Amino acid sequence: APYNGNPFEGVQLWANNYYRSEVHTLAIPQITDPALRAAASAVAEVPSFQWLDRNVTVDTLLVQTLSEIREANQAGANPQYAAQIVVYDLPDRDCAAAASNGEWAIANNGVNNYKAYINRIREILISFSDVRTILVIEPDSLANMVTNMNVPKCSGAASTYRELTIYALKQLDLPHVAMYMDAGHAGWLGWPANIQPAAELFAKIYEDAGKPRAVRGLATNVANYNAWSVSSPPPYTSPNPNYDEKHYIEAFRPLLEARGFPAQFIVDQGRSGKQPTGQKEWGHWCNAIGTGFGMRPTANTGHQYVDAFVWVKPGGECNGTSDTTAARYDYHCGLEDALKPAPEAGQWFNEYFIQLLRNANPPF
Numbered sequence: 001a002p003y004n005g006n007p008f009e010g011v012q013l014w015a016n017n018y019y020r021s022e023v024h025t026l027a028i029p030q031i032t033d034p035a036l037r038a039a040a041s042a043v044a045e046v047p048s049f050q051w052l053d054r055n056v057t058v059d060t061l062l063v064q065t066l067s068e069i070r071e072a073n074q075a076g077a078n079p080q081y082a083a084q085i086v087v088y089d090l091p092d093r094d095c096a097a098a099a100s101n102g103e104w105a106i107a108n109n110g111v112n113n114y115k116a117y118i119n120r121i122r123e124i125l126i127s128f129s130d131v132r133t134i135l136v137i138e139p140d141s142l143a144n145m146v147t148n149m150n151v152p153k154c155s156g157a158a159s160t161y162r163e164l165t166i167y168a169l170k171q172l173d174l175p176h177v178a179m180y181m182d183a184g185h186a187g188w189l190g191w192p193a194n195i196q197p198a199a200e201l202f203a204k205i206y207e208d209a210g211k212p213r214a215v216r217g218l219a220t221n222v223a224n225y226n227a228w229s230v231s232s233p234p235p236y237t238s239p240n241p242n243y244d245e246k247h248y249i250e251a252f253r254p255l256l257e258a259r260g261f262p263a264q265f266i267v268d269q270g271r272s273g274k275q276p277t278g279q280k281e282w283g284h285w286c287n288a289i290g291t292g293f294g295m296r297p298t299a300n301t302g303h304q305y306v307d308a309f310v311w312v313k314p315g316g317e318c319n320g321t322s323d324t325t326a327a328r329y330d331y332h333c334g335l336e337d338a339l340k341p342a343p344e345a346g347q348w349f350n351e352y353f354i355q356l357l358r359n360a361n362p363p364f
């Protein structure tokens, strides 16, 4: 079915069984404290995005979640539940990263692999047209074209990132779908020197895709820890005037809008509850200490440019291993402000989950 306006309005957000199963089968059994177990049980019901970060998730997790939502909706959910999904499998993924877990390479049929990926997701979404579906498109992709074109892998991947983003925006432009392209965070693209070129890039992509109706705007702070709005700039933000997501979005949207893209925003707050964080530098993204679960997902943001506060990166799922000998070890995960020992990216990290619980704001 079609919708008008903010896709988060008039629906409830589904909390998926993948995350719920991590909490119940992996987290809770390691927790003996009654209060923390009850808090954990509660966090399992908070509706976070489900990531299609590996091809195998398409015909498993995506189908499962949409099937489960349809079942719940047909069983009388009111209002109806909506899905929240991340598309995250570009070839030569994370081009500026020290290490990537992306499975596909441009040199190894990655373009065709990705197009097939998008085409299968399209088929599944059509099959589940009765479940409104909100997508985040490719974290850590086009933000690299703004600042990291000096990196050979990024320069070599740029035309592919662009073409394939346009491909996804057109192929997933379906009436029951909404899309938000990733747009980094205040401490990446919000810096004054970066913000106009970022607006130029995103608005051009939007134009080049034919301004598809399903595209609502942009997603910010995905997998990061920034504040939505705080009175004093965290120390590691200096000297950025855009020291929180509200400042970034208020500066960014007029630039985008003048360029033909009046983007609405969704802002990750899943690990933003504690401010300031334990990050020693803004760019320390990996398993940062001193962070907490943040404000609960809601369409009622109170801000004219923000369609929803969301939990995109699910807290407790590791950002990367701290084992320096591991094949895909990223040195950011070995820093003094990265919690250790940490398992491989995407694996449950229980000590990190407990940290997020203890620092939760609002508390569980």
Ligand SMILES: CO[C@@H]1O[C@H](CO)[C@@H](O[C@@H]2O[C@H](CO)[C@@H](S[C@@H]3O[C@H](CO)[C@@H](O[C@@H]4O[C@H](CO)[C@@H](O)[C@H](O)[C@H]4O)[C@H](O)[C@H]3O)[C@H](O)[C@H]2O)[C@H](O)[C@H]1O
Pocket: 094, 096, 097, 098, 139, 140, 147, 148, 187, 188, 189, 191, 192, 193, 194, 222, 223, 224, 239, 282, 283, 284, 285
């Ligand atoms: C006054 O001029 C400005 O000075 C400041 C301070 O020196 C400059 O700040 C620096 O901006 C850089 C970007 O231009 C970033 S690097 C940026 O960091 C982010 C994380 O915050 C990286 O994205 C993450 O990438 C990970 C993989 O490596 C992903 O796993 C993760 O999901 C992403 O968030 C990004 O790739 C990097 O390019 C510096 O941290 C910051 O100090 C500013 O540039 C000057 O204009």
Ligand SMILES: *[C@@H]1O[C@H](CO)[C@@H](O)[C@H](O)[C@H]1NC(C)=O
Pocket: 055, 056, 058, 059, 113, 120
């Ligand atoms: C991706 O998964 C699909 C099934 O959803 C499969 O048909 C395809 O072969 C997989 N892609 C690659 C490159 O292995």
